[PDB]
Amino acid sequence: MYLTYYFIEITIFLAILCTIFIISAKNPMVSILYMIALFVIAAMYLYLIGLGIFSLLYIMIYIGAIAVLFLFIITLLDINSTELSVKSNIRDLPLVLISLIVLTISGLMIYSNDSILINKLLEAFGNDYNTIITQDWFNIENTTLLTTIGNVLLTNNAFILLVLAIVLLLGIIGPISITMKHK
Amino acid sequence: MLILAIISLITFVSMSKLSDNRAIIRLINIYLILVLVLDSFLYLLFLNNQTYTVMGELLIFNSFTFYIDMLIYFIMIVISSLYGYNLYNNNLYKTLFEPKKELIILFLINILGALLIVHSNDFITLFVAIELQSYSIYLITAIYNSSYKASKASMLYFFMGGILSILIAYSINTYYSVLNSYTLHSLDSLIINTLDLNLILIALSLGLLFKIGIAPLHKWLISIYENTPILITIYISLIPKISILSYLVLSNISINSLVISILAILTLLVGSVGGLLQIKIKRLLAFSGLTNAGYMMLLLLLNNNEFSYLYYITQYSISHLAIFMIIIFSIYYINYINNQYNPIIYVNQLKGLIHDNAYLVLSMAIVVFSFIGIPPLLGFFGKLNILMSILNNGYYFISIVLIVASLISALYYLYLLNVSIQDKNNILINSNETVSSVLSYILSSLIILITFGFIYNSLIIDIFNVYFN
Amino acid sequence: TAAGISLTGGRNRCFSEWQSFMHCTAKTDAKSRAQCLPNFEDYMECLHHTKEKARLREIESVLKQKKEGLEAPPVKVIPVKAIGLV
Amino acid sequence: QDPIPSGALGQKVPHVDESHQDLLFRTSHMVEDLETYDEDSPINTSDANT
Amino acid sequence: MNTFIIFIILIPIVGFALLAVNILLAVYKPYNEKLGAFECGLTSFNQTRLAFNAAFILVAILFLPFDLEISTLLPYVMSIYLVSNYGFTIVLLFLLILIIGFVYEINTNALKINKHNKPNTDSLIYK
Amino acid sequence: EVRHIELPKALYQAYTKATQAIWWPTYSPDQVERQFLSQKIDPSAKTFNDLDLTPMELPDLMFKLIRPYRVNVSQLENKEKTFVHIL
Amino acid sequence: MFIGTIILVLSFLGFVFNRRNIILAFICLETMLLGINLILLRNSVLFDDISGSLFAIVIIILAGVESAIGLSLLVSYYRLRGVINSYGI
Numbered sequence A: 001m002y003l004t005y006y007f008i009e010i011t012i013f014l015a016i017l018c019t020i021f022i023i024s025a026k027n028p029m030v031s032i033l034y035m036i037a038l039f040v041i042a043a044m045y046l047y048l049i050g051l052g053i054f055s056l057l058y059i060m061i062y063i064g065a066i067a068v069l070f071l072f073i074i075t076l077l078d079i080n081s082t083e084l085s086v087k088s089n090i091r092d093l094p095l096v097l098i099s100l101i102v103l104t105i106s107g108l109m110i111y112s113n114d115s116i117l118i119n120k121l122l123e124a125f126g127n128d129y130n131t132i133i134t135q136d137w138f139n140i141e142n143t144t145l146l147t148t149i150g151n152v153l154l155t156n157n158a159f160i161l162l163v164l165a166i167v168l169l170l171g172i173i174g175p176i177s178i179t180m181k182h183k
Numbered sequence B: 001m002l003i004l005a006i007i008s009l010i011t012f013v014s015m016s017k018l019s020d021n022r023a024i025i026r027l028i029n030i031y032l033i034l035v036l037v038l039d040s041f042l043y044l045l046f047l048n049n050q051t052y053t054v055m056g057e058l059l060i061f062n063s064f065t066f067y068i069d070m071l072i073y074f075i076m077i078v079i080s081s082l083y084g085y086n087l088y089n090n091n092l093y094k095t096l097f098e099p100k101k102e103l104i105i106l107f108l109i110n111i112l113g114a115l116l117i118v119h120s121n122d123f124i125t126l127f128v129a130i131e132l133q134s135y136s137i138y139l140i141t142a143i144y145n146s147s148y149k150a151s152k153a154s155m156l157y158f159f160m161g162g163i164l165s166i167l168i169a170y171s172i173n174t175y176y177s178v179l180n181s182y183t184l185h186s187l188d189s190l191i192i193n194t195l196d197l198n199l200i201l202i203a204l205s206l207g208l209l210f211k212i213g214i215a216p217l218h219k220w221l222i223s224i225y226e227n228t229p230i231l232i233t234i235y236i237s238l239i240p241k242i243s244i245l246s247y248l249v250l251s252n253i254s255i256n257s258l259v260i261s262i263l264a265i266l267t268l269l270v271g272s273v274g275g276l277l278q279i280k281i282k283r284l285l286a287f288s289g290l291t292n293a294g295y296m297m298l299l300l301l302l303n304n305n306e307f308s309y310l311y312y313i314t315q316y317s318i319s320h321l322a323i324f325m326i327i328i329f330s331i332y333y334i335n336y337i338n339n340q341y342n343p344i345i346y347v348n349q350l351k352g353l354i355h356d357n358a359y360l361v362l363s364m365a366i367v368v369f370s371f372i373g374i375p376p377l378l379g380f381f382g383k384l385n386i387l388m389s390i391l392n393n394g395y396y397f398i399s400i401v402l403i404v405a406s407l408i409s410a411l412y413y414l415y416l417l418n419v420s421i422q423d424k425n426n427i428l429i430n431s432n433e434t435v436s437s438v439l440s441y442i443l444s445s446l447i448i449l450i451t452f453g454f455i456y457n458s459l460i461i462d463i464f465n466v467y468f469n
Numbered sequence C: 001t002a003a004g005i006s007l008t009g010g011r012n013r014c015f016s017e018w019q020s021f022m023h024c025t026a027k028t029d030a031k032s033r034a035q036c037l038p039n040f041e042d043y044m045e046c047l048h049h050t051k052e053k054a055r056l057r058e059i060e061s062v063l064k065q066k067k068e069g070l071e072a073p074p075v076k077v078i079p080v081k082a083i084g085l086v
Numbered sequence D: 001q002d003p004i005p006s007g008a009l010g011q012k013v014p015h016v017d018e019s020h021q022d023l024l025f026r027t028s029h030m031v032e033d034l035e036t037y038d039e040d041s042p043i044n045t046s047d048a049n050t
Numbered sequence E: 001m002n003t004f005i006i007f008i009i010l011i012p013i014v015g016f017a018l019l020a021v022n023i024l025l026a027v028y029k030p031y032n033e034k035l036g037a038f039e040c041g042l043t044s045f046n047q048t049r050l051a052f053n054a055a056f057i058l059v060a061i062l063f064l065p066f067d068l069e070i071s072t073l074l075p076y077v078m079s080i081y082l083v084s085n086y087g088f089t090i091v092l093l094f095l096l097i098l099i100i101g102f103v104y105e106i107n108t109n110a111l112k113i114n115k116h117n118k119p120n121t122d123s124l125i126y127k
Numbered sequence F: 001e002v003r004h005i006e007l008p009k010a011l012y013q014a015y016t017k018a019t020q021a022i023w024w025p026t027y028s029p030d031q032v033e034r035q036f037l038s039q040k041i042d043p044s045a046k047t048f049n050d051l052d053l054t055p056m057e058l059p060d061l062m063f064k065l066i067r068p069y070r071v072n073v074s075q076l077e078n079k080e081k082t083f084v085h086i087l
Numbered sequence G: 001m002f003i004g005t006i007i008l009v010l011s012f013l014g015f016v017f018n019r020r021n022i023i024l025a026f027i028c029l030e031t032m033l034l035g036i037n038l039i040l041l042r043n044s045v046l047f048d049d050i051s052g053s054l055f056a057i058v059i060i061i062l063a064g065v066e067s068a069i070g071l072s073l074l075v076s077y078y079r080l081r082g083v084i085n086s087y088g089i
């Protein structure tokens, strides 16, 4: 029963692991395949948190369009790459370690509002209390999450859908207009 | 009415030939003119600083933003006249200054993305409109693709705009993680006391500001401004500056900011002493943009800065636009044209300019003494009204560093004059073909605004007293 | 916008505390928002549960120090296939 | 045709002739300013996509 | 334990088992003339890089902005009853803004590859 | 870089003993004992020199037998700026 | 918030210290965007609203169009120079 407890933490570790194989892989398209694996780990986490809708939107849109675009580029184009030699990146290692420490801690800092800096960080780790889920019988219809997105994209934020249409238009016009060579 | 222009235009450009492209831009030029003339009267809505929120807590319309809107239309009428009109009727200038088919498409989509920031209340409206204008600057840079430098600059601008878009997005979602809210309208001056929103709002400001050219991260923008051709770069210099700055001046999230104050000091320093020993005119001319974007970052620290801002905006826009238009005209008089996209580069190429079209040097002088802040010209009241806001509000070390930065920045402004009023051995005696009447009238109009624009200072302030108070 | 719209389209978890704070700010001019502090404090701790976690670690630190531990009507945990067993 | 070109601090700056685009001038080491050898000039391109 | 996840665990073990029975049961026995790619019974030099047409790359670059619309029409189709008469017009306008960019694409003939097989248009003018 | 392990002999011997029970031909466990025994040549014998042959050396002929398992800057980029890549 | 922050920071440092090719820089940008998504989607679930899910479903599409635009920028960069450098642009 408690084998099903650490899943979220496992995915975190697994996601960490995947990024080290992205930035360090001899072949490029092997590392882009590791990125596809990282999208799959993300969709695992999104089902695992309770958002089963998004996981399939990630597998549809990111894996099935953006990664297919990337692999399709790497095939018929020329990209040189150098291996992860120790001699070229051992000079980077100290600024890597300093930036790991600072950017990690300072990303963990703004979730919290004590004026004292050390009290900001420890509130990042005090999560071990279990939220209580109560059944309320106030809702009468199966408004899923995608229904509510389609109500708020279409009434309250219809202009954002319409400016978004201008952006999708631009994403059509642009690549065309570069790669035409008209006449 | 930009929407109707884009929807009509790209259908119309799909059916026109290549040779029609020029004349298409002429049409759009006149179109935007009759959006200024026949639609200005909407300023009557904005009496006594009445503000509207349209599309449901989404776009905020005040008269500050109405003025920014009108300024962006005026400068586009200029830039569109630069593409749509011939300089001369030579076989030379047809292959040097020639618009692409889809150029005006990306222009109007860019102005759309730049207006949906200054008018913006929401953060996702902010994010979508920054993304729209960032794509448009990507594609306006890469549209002259048969150039090595422009393609390298478009790639550089892509990655450095991607980082500072994900920093803005991280700041928006960091703000959301502590407040279930999207507006800075929710802040309402009680919350800032009891909530540590310093690091959030400051990081949001920074991720918006590093796209301007603020000075720790200024080298990549000077490289893009030198690598792009001479017509693309008077647009991509001006538009993200006035759009992003008139966002951040409207919403006052960095007041008593120590980080914005450091970066303002550092900007005024390494902008004035950056562009001193430089020999390329777009370089020289792009560190003038770094210092004059430094004078804005001061006004972000301010409360109630809407006079100093707007006046120094239209100052910098007219002066900017005029000094780029002057070195378009000096191309006929140089003895050496390289690099078809960027025909004048080195600042010693305009050397004998007083002996050939001396009133181009009168024009050049009048605009460059206005960058320095000489009092009969319009640039001085801009620097003056910035100084009146800086000293009012306790920024005393900022003020003397402003002054030292203005004095250092006068050197490489006067280097343009030093080179221009010199002896040249071979002077022009007569020219067969002359310059476009409707296009040189624009430079004459842009000077007479700078020269004789201190006249209306009184009138403007009284008008400023009614519609913003 | 979607200020208080929940996942099912309803009102979110801290809507009532937020609408109470907006009642507080509606009837109140500036230089007198210092009375509007407890509604804001209630809203922020509805969001993040900071005072609640503080109180629970204050009582959990006492719970581990007792050798008796629990003398109360206890809480019994069940496996998921045994909701209504007995 | 000056004796010495000026550079806003009295420095000596190079006068840019057609003679600055050769093979030794190609891929030199320098900051992006004060540099000759543009990548786009009609003697450096020389049938660039033929 | 539903019967949904036995399946997603259970297809791979079948595939790993069929790959394993091939690796275990067939011989291996290779050499150099067996190795090497197939082109019609003739070896050749492969060129290091080859050129391509702009329409080949343009199909899949252009594919994604149409795909992102088709997944943007997916929130609407689930909420189509709630936004009666109003979200209808917004989705109309959204689709029309898309359709005019599409008619830009079809007017430019962006995905069409021309043929350089011209039948010698120019006639025979003599002397 | 071909792999190298060099684990002790008795564990290695027991591993070969384990792998003897499989149908395809595996490394022998008495081939472990021949890893110690080296080339002991009888001087009272006749070599290649008798029948008029000179044997070919291993380094001259390593390249031919190992050919299928073989895996595989600025002047190119100055020369590739004249070709056409997009048509 | 741990998984989104760790994906963002590790992807950011892998982007910064990229010297080996350019497609690693693109995919480090996309993994960053995934991390910002993860942080926001969790904040939506914990706060009981679609609001951050609204910003999420918009930034999905904007990440898509960013990929489409920028990879066409790369094809334009590659058109004049038949090889992409290892050290970078």
Ligand SMILES: CCCCC/C=C/C/C=C/CCCCCCCC(=O)O[C@H](COC(=O)CCCCCCCCCCCCCCC)COP(=O)([O-])OCC[N+](C)(C)C
Residues within 6 Å of the ligand: B036, B037, B040, B041, B043, B063, B066, B067, B070, B071, B074, B306, B307, B310, B311, B314, B315, B449, B452, B453, B454, B456, B460, B463, B464, B467
């Ligand atoms: C038949 C309509 C004709 C179309 C007019 C289109 C103009 C587009 C040009 C925009 C930039 C140019 C500067 C315009 C200044 C308007 C001042 C104003 O009044 O600004 C005020 C406050 O300004 C500011 O903060 C400071 C701006 C200071 C400008 C500094 C430049 C001074 C020199 C040029 C001005 C005098 C030239 C007159 C020549 C006879 C608020 O703006 P407002 O809401 O009252 O707009 C007025 C509606 N008006 C346009 C239809 C009348």
